[PDB]
Design a protein around this ligand. Structure first.
Ligand code: HEM
Ligand code: HEM
Lengths: 727, 727
């Protein structure tokens, strides 16, 4: 045949295009000129296709790939069909075990560069010079669900970064909240068992809203801090581009003089912090369970590269015990009001992978993979993680040679006396496979530690204690950080936390677990406890009403850096606006709308009651991106309704529903000319309302008003009004 | 210790209870007295818990399961902590590869029994006596998505049954539609690759609504038949209890005299056929991705055992060539108007598993597992399946001894000379591991074929032809079955098919693919092609308008057994009704409502604006099951609103939205007394309308009317009215 069309419409343009303009494709075909040392080094295993003959894996050309070999055209298939058997066998063996946690994830390639040399505090080569660029590979993920679960669940998110440094791979394997649920790695199977689907029936997926999770939390108050972050809007990010990242544990930075400095790692999203609202997130898991995966991929194809600032909280070794919390306790955060985040460098994700399985699914990150200039601490959760990644990757990725899988390979040299193992790629020519050896003059050889290019030596921390299985008494405080978090949130963020706990505990079948969680909230803050209790039909006791609130954290009664929205940081580039078309669109409005959006890097999606095209007043042919039902308001940041023949869409139920949903979800809406007739559906004032942009036409200040609302993300003042709308 | 409450509310009652009344639990604890030979034979591997000490896997009691061993309570974790290392190691290795296809599935144990001896047509032991009971294990599944994807997607469903017979395991591995998409097994990797998530970015999950699927369909017209079924409401079943099951392929039955009879296998749902509507199914993927799994599990815990009647379509050997279609072509169905389904037996699923992973995830089904009395045919899709299941299970389940994993083990004797392999459990004492042998007097020994308890011998079919990779010319007809299916559907079923095609093609980014699909629909039926074209903004050509319709199927212009709903078969037992409460419910209404529902085996869920309890007018304390938002109308089959203080929920946006959503999804709604004020929300006439039950109180005829509507499943007459509602 064949039938790719004559117009060449099958193939997407190899240039940045806005979401939905062209079919997506493998990164190296979408952006062939985007390169980095790692992307180039993968060239040996990239496999093309065009102009090549179809063959078996042994290189034999196939003549007929449509039929098995049989004795007669209606006869039995013959065992000698080696073509069919290789093809079916490889298909039969396609799947590998998904990760134990973080199985649902989306990744991209990029690069990192420090703003200045950090040689006074660390000898890490990748932070030693502002013009030294280090390729990275980043994988973002949910945490509980399987690899086929949905993106916009309520859950913690993983944020893992593989740095291909000149002195080794450093993996920074963090999450989107600055603490973890538990204190010691020994409890990790217990916690993860409690949050994952229950064992009898394997329900629920991607949800902590079930009895065993809340049983565990209620019995293990150390979890309450991260639970508070998960119940807030932090648990439902708008995009991986708009959430923070944290390494959680205190690590060490080691300089050339041997000085150790404690450090906690942060990633700041340069697109700003932004989250969905629960009803929107939950409905989006049904409308588009691949929303975050798609959003990341389309941002990079559009040139809206995710950018993050690496930042360090630095504490001198002499200040280890100066806080009212233990620095080694992963359930405690270090307030930025106490220890500021120093900016360190920028990370840009600018290329999607070519093959998700080969590059994303087989990537292996490990917090153990550190480099000279970095070291660990005794945090008891970090200590046990050091054992687990290595162990799980051998079974997940089939053997001990997972570092030879292309995405995992260092770009710098690697030489040692390790040999064999399943799927061994490297063919070693060294005469010796042991050291010391004389037969190869002891090569490859050990290298002493030094200021640069030196071997790894651990910091010589003094260890003094008996061999004990004991929690440090300093870790036995569970309510002051949850309280600090609570008081740092805005009133509307506090309401959403309450709503999250209420919704989750309403799904817990055993009422006494609900009551025990409420009792724990009474140890954090009474207003919080009472608001959740009222939603659960629970009444606090007199004793509960008199629980003394936990102490402030080093005199802090709040830290605004813990809130998503108290300090504006809203950027609109990369956001999307739905434009609800009609069959006689006033092109003056459309011109003005698209020009204003284009100027700020905001994308548009043209919607209608059907697919195809509609023609504007002026004759302009407009292509329809999707239908009102086909691409609901859940997927956009704002909605504009231009003037024209509004009767065409005024009696359309889907069109009205579109605005009711967007209104409920606090998204800015802009109506021009006769589009103002839609105000009745969303029942608000004859004279108007903050959050609803309206004018006779879409001109000068109309688009400016709409853009200012989008920079603020959502219209929080509309909260009290949304409860009367049936949406 | 003592974390369980002293009223014993942590533990669910060991007796049938309605959905939501008690926490769910492992089958053997929930129904200890429900037994069968297979369930009894698994007792040797069932492990309890209560009153035992916590140990390592080697039997060593653990003292402190809260902490790792470290040097000092704030020191480093020590390598010698063997307890931590075993616990983390086992956790790190929990996952196994998911099934290549049908990775999402839900299973239960039950039993089968034939109505009468079928010895005249088959010597299969399990079909030989009405008193012979055969334990079964059934796994239902979706087909495209991973194990963590959602249940109510649009997709084919798998229906696999493992019969533990006295002469061997027979697995009947079928789907919920009577044909498959492709003709020859060589194309299975191509088709599956096309429907699964696209390889560069691994989107979309659980959906065929993407370009590669429709590209393949457009290029391979053999797919159109199953595609028609998938786009119909067949692709979105209400529950696994309410869908049909088919083996698809023509197999053979072989009696004791050696006569072969062609057979196609059917499962009829005794609960009747019933599906969701697309908007409901897609929203239910977000609100409860585990809806079918949960529904199956809770039906069994309630005593609403899923029941299916096994039926055979039987064709004499000499009638092989008497149809317009080839009996070996799996893209063609055998119309029940031509060859009736003979009732054969009943299957009842009456016990859930104890551990989903151990029993469901490791279950292994193979269509090649047949028993004497059955045989295969040359259907080329079935022939290639024979090779694939064995192959894939060794990698999925770790080795060649997967038949020793408890759920997969036969209940009958198994003895042979096979030895070793990974994870070997059986310790063979036979002196010989080969035959022929004299050292063990040749045991175990082969057995001749015979009427009962004999060895397997294949039916001696004549084979005549050259070795060729060639499709039979008899399979080259692709549009008459699609058209037969189309014409057999009700008008509302036809609209739902049109809507499915239009929705899915609107998600295809390359417009030419949409056009190619429409052209293939114009070879099936012009009305169908025009309606889908209109929704895509596509205009058929004059040549497309003149394509002659394909021929009838052996004189048939329709067959009502292909419709879900043209012949009523509606059962209400097991269905559920939402009851929207208010703070002063009129208990006369509630007593009448609940007793009427209870008499027909219909469940109820009492909803309110919060959790806890509400008090009825006469002091009756009413326990709240869930909130309006917490348990949406998506999860119920009907909604009743009793009288009382309606002002309490009349202003509630969620309560109104609950009715608008239920109304739009065609569910019966019943309003009593003051609850009739809600009619304005759903814009129903003053006089009333069919599908809305209304009266002054919930008495005599009110509940009979509502139950009548529930037996008809949905209110199809309301279809024209739902478009004006913004829901
Ligand atoms: C501060 C606490 C933790 C953080 C921030 C964290 C973060 C993550 C992330 C982001 C991933 C996915 C990396 C990817 O995208 O492939 C991951 C995977 C994993 N984590 Fe951790 N995790 C933490 C605690 C733990 C603990 C305590 C253990 C066990 C002792 C653990 C065991 C695992 C395992 C087994 C995997 C799968 C790795 C693989 O298959 O390649 N995690 N974790
Ligand atoms: C009439 C056509 C087909 C039907 C009705 C069918 C049905 C099913 C069902 C219901 C399952 C899941 C069983 C379970 O619940 O574990 C399954 C699995 C599977 N199917 Fe088939 N299938 C068909 C065609 C094919 C073909 C043509 C092939 C390959 C040549 C194939 C390969 C597989 C594989 C590899 C699995 C996974 C088995 C395992 O891991 O245990 N299927 N199929």
């Amino acid at each position: 045949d064949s039938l790719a069309p004559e117009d060449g419409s099958h193939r997407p343009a190899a240039e940045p295009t806005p979401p939905g303009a062209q079919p997506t494709a493998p990164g190296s075909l979408k952006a062939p000129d985007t390169r980095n040392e790692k992307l180039n080094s993968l060239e040996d295993v990239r496999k093309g296709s065009e102009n090549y003959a179809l063959t078996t894996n042994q290189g034999v050309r196939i003549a007929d790939d449509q039929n098995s070999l049989r004795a007669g055209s209606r006869g039995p298939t013959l065992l000698e069909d080696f073509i069919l058997r290789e093809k079916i066998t490889h298909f039969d063996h396609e799947r590998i075990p998904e990760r134990i946690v973080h199985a649902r994830g989306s990744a991209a390639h990029g690069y990192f560069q420090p703003y200045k040399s950090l040689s006074d505090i660390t000898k890490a080569d990748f932070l030693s010079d502002p013009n030294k660029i280090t390729p990275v590979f980043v994988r973002f993920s949910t945490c509980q669900g399987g690899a086929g679960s949905a993106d916009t669940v309520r859950d913690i998110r993983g944020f893992a970064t593989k740095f291909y440094t000149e002195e080794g791979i450093f993996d920074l394997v963090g999450n989107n909240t600055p603490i973890f649920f538990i204190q010691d790695a020994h409890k990790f199977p217990d916690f993860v068992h409690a949050v994952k689907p229950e064992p009898h029936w394997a329900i629920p997926q991607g949800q902590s809203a079930h009895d065993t999770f809340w049983d565990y939390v209620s019995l293990q108050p150390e979890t309450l801090h991260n639970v508070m972050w998960a119940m807030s809007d932090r648990g439902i990010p708008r995009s991986y581009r708009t959430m923070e990242g944290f390494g959680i544990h205190t690590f060490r930075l080691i300089n050339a003089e041997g000085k150790a400095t404690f450090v906690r790692f942060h990633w700041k999203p340069l697109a700003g912090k932004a989250s969905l609202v629960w009803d929107e997130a939950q409905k989006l898991t049904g409308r588009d369970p691949d929303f975050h995966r798609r959003e990341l991929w389309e941002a990079i194809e559009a040139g809206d590269f995710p950018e993050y600032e690496l930042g360090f909280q630095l504490i001198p070794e002499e200040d280890e015990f100066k806080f009212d919390f233990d620095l080694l306790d992963p359930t405690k955060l270090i307030p930025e009001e106490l220890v500021p985040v120093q900016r360190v460098g920028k990370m840009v994700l600018n290329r999607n992978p070519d093959n998700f399985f080969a590059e994303n699914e087989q990537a292996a990150f490990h917090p153990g993979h550190i480099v000279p200039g970095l070291d660990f601490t005794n945090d008891p959760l970090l200590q046990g993680r050091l054992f687990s990644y290595t162990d799980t990757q051998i079974s997940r990725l089939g053997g001990p040679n997972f570092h030879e899988i292309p995405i995992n390979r260092p770009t710098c040299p690697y030489h040692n006396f390790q040999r064999d193992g399943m799927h061994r790629m490297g063919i070693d020519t060294n005469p010796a496979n042991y050291e010391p050896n004389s037969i190869n003059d002891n090569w490859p050889r050990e290298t002493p530690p030094g200021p640069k290019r030196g071997g790894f030596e651990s910091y010589q921390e003094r260890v003094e204690g008996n061999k004990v299985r004991e929690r440090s008494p300093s870790f036995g405080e569970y309510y002051s950080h949850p309280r600090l978090f609570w008081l740092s949130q805005t009133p509307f963020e506090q309401r959403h936390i309450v709503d999250g706990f209420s919704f989750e505990l309403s799904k817990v079948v055993r009422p006494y677990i609900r009551e025990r969680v409420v009792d724990q909230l009474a140890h954090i803050d009474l207003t919080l406890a009472q608001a959740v209790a009222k939603n659960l039909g629970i009444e606090l006791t007199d004793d509960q009403l008199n629980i003394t609130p936990p102490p402030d954290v080093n005199g802090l009664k709040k830290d605004p850096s813990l809130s998503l929205y108290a300090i504006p940081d809203g950027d609109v580039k990369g956001r999307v606006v739905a434009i609800l078309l009609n069959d006689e669109v006033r092109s003056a409005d459309l011109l003005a709308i698209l020009k204003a959006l284009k100027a700020k890097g905001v994308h548009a999606k043209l919607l209608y009651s059907r697919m195809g095209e509609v023609t504007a007043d002026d004759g302009t042919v407009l292509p329809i991106a999707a239908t009102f039902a086909g691409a609901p308001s859940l997927t956009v940041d704002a909605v504009i309704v231009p003037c024209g023949n509004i009767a065409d869409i005024a009696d359309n139920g889907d069109a009205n529903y579109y605005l009711m949903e967007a209104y409920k979800h606090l998204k800015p809406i802009a109506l021009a000319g006769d589009a103002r007739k839609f105000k009745a559906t969303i029942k608000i004032a004859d004279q108007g309302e903050e959050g609803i942009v309206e004018a006779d036409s879409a001109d000068g200040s109309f688009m400016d008003e709409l853009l200012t609302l989008m920079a603020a993300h959502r219209v929080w003042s509309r909260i009290p009004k949304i409860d009367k709308i049936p949406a």
